[PDB]
Amino acid sequence: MEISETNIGIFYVSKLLALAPYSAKKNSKGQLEITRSWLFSIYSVCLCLIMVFLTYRGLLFDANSNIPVRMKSATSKVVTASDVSVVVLAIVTGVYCGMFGLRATQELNTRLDKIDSTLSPYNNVKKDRWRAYAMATVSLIVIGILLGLDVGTWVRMAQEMEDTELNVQWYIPFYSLYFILTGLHINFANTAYGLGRRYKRLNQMLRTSYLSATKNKSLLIRAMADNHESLGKCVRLLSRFYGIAVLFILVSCLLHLVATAYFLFLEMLNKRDNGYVWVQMLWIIFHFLRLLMVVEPCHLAAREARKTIQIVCEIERKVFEPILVEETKKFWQQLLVDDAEFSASGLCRVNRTILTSFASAIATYLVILIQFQK
Amino acid sequence: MEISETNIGIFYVSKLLALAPYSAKKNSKGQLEITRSWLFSIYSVCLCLIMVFLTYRGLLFDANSNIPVRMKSATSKVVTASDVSVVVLAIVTGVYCGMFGLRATQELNTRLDKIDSTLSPYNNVKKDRWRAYAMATVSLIVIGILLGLDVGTWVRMAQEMEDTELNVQWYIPFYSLYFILTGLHINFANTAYGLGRRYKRLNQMLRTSYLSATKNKSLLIRAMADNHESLGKCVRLLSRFYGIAVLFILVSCLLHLVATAYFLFLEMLNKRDNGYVWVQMLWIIFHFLRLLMVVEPCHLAAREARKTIQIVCEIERKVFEPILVEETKKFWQQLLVDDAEFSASGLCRVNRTILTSFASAIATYLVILIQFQK
Amino acid sequence: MEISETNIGIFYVSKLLALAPYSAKKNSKGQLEITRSWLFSIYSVCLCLIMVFLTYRGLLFDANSNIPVRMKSATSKVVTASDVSVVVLAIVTGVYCGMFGLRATQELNTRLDKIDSTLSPYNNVKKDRWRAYAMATVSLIVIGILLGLDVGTWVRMAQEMEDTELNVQWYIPFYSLYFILTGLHINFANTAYGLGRRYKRLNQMLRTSYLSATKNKSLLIRAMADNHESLGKCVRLLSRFYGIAVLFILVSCLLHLVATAYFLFLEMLNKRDNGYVWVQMLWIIFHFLRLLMVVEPCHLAAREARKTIQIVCEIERKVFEPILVEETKKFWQQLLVDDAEFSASGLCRVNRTILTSFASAIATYLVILIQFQK
Amino acid sequence: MEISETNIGIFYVSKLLALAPYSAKKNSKGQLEITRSWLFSIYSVCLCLIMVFLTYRGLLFDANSNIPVRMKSATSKVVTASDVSVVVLAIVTGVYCGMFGLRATQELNTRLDKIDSTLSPYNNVKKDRWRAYAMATVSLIVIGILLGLDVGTWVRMAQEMEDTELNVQWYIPFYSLYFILTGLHINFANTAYGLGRRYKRLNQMLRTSYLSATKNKSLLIRAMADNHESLGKCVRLLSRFYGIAVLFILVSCLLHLVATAYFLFLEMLNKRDNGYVWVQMLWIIFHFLRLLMVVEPCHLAAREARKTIQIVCEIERKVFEPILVEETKKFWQQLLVDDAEFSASGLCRVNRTILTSFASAIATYLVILIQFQK
Lengths: 374, 374, 374, 374
Ligand SMILES: OC[C@H]1O[C@](O)(CO)[C@@H](O)[C@@H]1O
Ligand SMILES: OC[C@H]1O[C@](O)(CO)[C@@H](O)[C@@H]1O
Ligand SMILES: OC[C@H]1O[C@](O)(CO)[C@@H](O)[C@@H]1O
Ligand SMILES: OC[C@H]1O[C@](O)(CO)[C@@H](O)[C@@H]1O
What we know:
Four copies of one chain form a homotetramer.
Chain A: H1 9-16, E1 22-25, E2 33-36, H2 38-63, H3 75-99, H4 102-117, H5 125-160, H6 165-169, H7 172-209, H8 215-270, H9 274-291, H10 295-306, H11 309-317, H12 322-337, H13 353-373
Antiparallel strand pairs in A: 1-2
The complex binds beta-D-fructofuranose (4 copies).
């Protein structure tokens, strides 16, 4: 995860949501330093364990309730349990990654500091801060009104048939855990989008400074080679930090994209109220947007990294000095060798192609289950 | 999309079908210039919106009609809605690509002009114009008689049980939108086939001029290197212009190849008239041909681009001059680096392998659905 | 397809089976010449058309017979029609490839002649002839007793309930077409195995002559580079000749591996005679062996082609002369560039990985269909 | 398989379990020599044949018993037969690989001896021996208590309804064969983990000795190039030795991960005793751990092999001598050329991506079968 004074609200939100128990303390030479927060580590572990235990306790309390609200069936129980358990797994993986990842975070931030140090000409900070804050605020607000609307529609259905108020607020830990899931998505989307933006700036350096004695050109070549190595290693560091968390996030998103669609189809077939149908449509849209927050930044970063050698050849021809050509040859050898694709801890490569495979899964399941219903 | 006086009827047809609101005006130095047509942009947006609203209005009017003609079932409604909605999505994506794509079209045509400028020896214009016009006319005619036959068979079935004339002409916007889909297929097939033909000419240059002082050979090497870069970038420009349109076209084609087959199987099982069965067989053949108009040109272009280094090695050995060998080394470095595969906006690579995967999908669905029917 | 005096019986059998209407006439300078046989081309087209029409006529005659023997059901009809039609498609594709492939065959044989010309030290002809003749004889004999056993078991079942003799010999064209399918498999297996054996000899040249003035070493380097180009181009020529025929062969083999397994499962569930069960087990084994006659030779050829640069590096280090090192550098550049994987006309790459995918299909279908039966 | 005095207990256990009929005899010059044990080869073949015949005899004896214990159904019979037969196939493949693999084992051990000879600085033997012995003991113990618990729960269920003691001990050969399967897993996990650890040491050599006259640096470069070749060839030797055994192990693991899950779901639906449910949960966990003993070591080895050129570039820049740079260029050419991914005899590449595909299979089957049950 990325820690910087460009956008420190994201780090504070992640720490609040028990996903980054860290401390951001400066020294005199700038260089924001990330240290382990022992007071916040125990807070994160306690909050994660308490929230998971609470949502599971509410889950089995609804299951054992006299009139169940959310899980009253042989199949509704299984699907609701799968949804809650996959959300719990995503939360636990995010907390585990944020806890035992201090060294990876420190190394990634140290590399990013040197990356930003030599990217001055197109280092526009205000726009980056505004974009990051807007993305975080929009994500938190959309999930806030989504959880509020979900509470409202479930309250409406429960009151349709202490009545049910405690039965429906038994899922408050579930929505609190959804909040932590949104925070984890915010963190990963910020880090990957920052890596992609730095790759864009790296591509821009060679695109404008060269395709427009002279040892400054050789210095720029060496600095950009170091920058491309640092970005390629930062992608690997991110894959070490949130690789399994992103895997479980993708699994949760696929499971939700299947289960919410199945619930919407069943509810439409039963010819019930329009509120639950609209809420499930909003949930499907939100799940699609959530999926377009992990595959999209990784795809952008990989595509921008791949677009460096294709411009490096241009300097390879548009050079005459015997030293700068050798330097560009080394850079070309790098880009022939380097590969900066995000990996979900080695199981899969996160990019837009997943969007196809997920569909190839969903269009399968939605073809099977529906045909079993009718 | 490609604009040239070699075949200007395709551009005029695309502009008529609300898919290319552009103006082709020359200057004195040849160089056909493509400008944004503000009068035609509003016409395109109005036609697209009106056509989509009209086909949807007819869709729900048939659904709410006293005796529905095309959608009278719980499953027929869903499948017909899926077909109409996927056609609508393809049309909307094509219009959106043709509207917000002026810069990409201008850059692609500017690059293609320089490509054709230095490909004189095998620049045969009359055959290219005849082939493009024949392909466009055949596509439009086949879809015309197909829509006419579909109107006829649906009229026959509707009259089998204002009677039904307004109910059956409620789908005239649907067939008008199918016409725009055919026009979009024509446009993409023309552009991709032109890129492939230029790749073939590029391969022919090095295949005949070298495998048969002398600085003309070095000049030809440099010109062909520039040509291969321009073609590789033109493939990327096309992937930027029609990348998502081709994705939605492939999705529509897969959905139709499944739905038309399911309808044919159901209709054969019900033992009804032979006209609808033959019309659906023709529709399946047309959908297969439509699929063999996006994967086929992209596959041809990629295969012809891949067949350049495999001939570049021949000059790499069949050269003696110290400068021409270095030039061929740079060209070889390009072809080792370059990749000219069309991408459907990053989700998938369009080639003949899709034909396999589509089958692996269809043979799945046609195995499931049929087993659910029997 | 490969024509040589090393094994001319395979070519004669292929010509007899309407799969190679060619003439093998020598000139004084050795160099067996393949010419188009106009007398045999019309024979091949007539035999193919007559056989296809005859098997289809018998198919619909059994379907319309008073007591059908092989197709008396709603599903048995469909599965039997699929089997017969896929066999017919394979036969038609093989005949079409053998007819409009004179130029490809001539070029492939011309390249193979030069390949064998400079592979003298390990050119062992008697073993190659014996292996090819044994493979062809074993394939023909196994299919002969398989068709005989199939005739016997179907006669037994038909007589269990002109009685049925004409109804059961209505499928004699089907088994005659199976004979042509076996001949096509023999042809492709001979050609691909010859390409693989020549790749093995090429790998052996560099493995023994170098890893054991001296311009003979440079001559050997140049000759082996030419040989590797000729083999890589011969693989492409074979992919042009039998690319679609191999695709339809793989489709037929997958369809048969599914259908025969489904029939065996159904017959075991019905608790009928053991003869049909054993015949279907033999048919499944034969279909598996048939599949291990297209993926196996292509996989062997690709694996042996890939094992050339991995030994080329050895000479790259074990050389001292400034000219031989440059020659080995060119050879290494080839093997870095070259790719000699057989392609089924671009849809898929034929290798052992298909064996996995086929299973991933079969284990799917055999899981679905069976669960639908019980 | 790896034979060394570092861990000789694994070899002795494998020989005892009829998976390595070899003899480890030293000569005076160290260099542990592996010879074929004719006394142990016949013992291995007899034990394998007797065990397979015994488990099959017990299988059909339970099937033909008056009151079947494990297979009393139309589907339970099929699933139990599939499990037992896939275990038998894995055992037979392991025995066949261990018998006809003397040359491959000898070559692999000879290469590994030279690998370990020049890896002295980080050659820590005590930790390697402790880790290997602990892994083997833990695997054997976990499978021992698992088979004991399985015997106990099956005895409990059988006594719930000579009573059944001989019927339940009719599966003692099945659990004895499971022991041999565990031994095969131990052998492959030891060999692949040793290859990965040697790759780690190779990566460490260049990571510490260079990234910290001088011909010792060139000597180290040459030695590490030879080491990387030897490791790449040792991976190929392992793929030759246990390639098909690992394929059948993966097939068995997938079949078990599906069948045990189906049994657990059915047993939970039937609302039976908790002991069988907990035993099946333990079996699922053990099968997952077994799967994380073939994909995990191969993935680690491939990932560590891929992390060599990415550090080789560092010496490529951090060198000044004209000879050491040329040596590093040759090493870079290797790592650009080399590929050290384990292959299951060419059908598939064993890595963590399989974990995804297996899930994509399981999540399919568990979606189908369950929907067929309800
Ligand atoms: O409660 C929120 C979660 O449960 C569902 O609403 C099920 O209807 C899912 O769509 C969503 O992920
Ligand atoms: O109306 C044309 C469209 O609707 C169908 O005819 C359904 O029968 C499809 O085959 C076709 O794509
Ligand atoms: O007639 C031979 C063909 O038909 C079947 O026997 C069906 O039982 C198939 O197994 C085989 O391919
Ligand atoms: O007997 C052990 C084997 O049989 C099962 O227990 C079936 O319940 C499997 O889980 C296991 O692989």
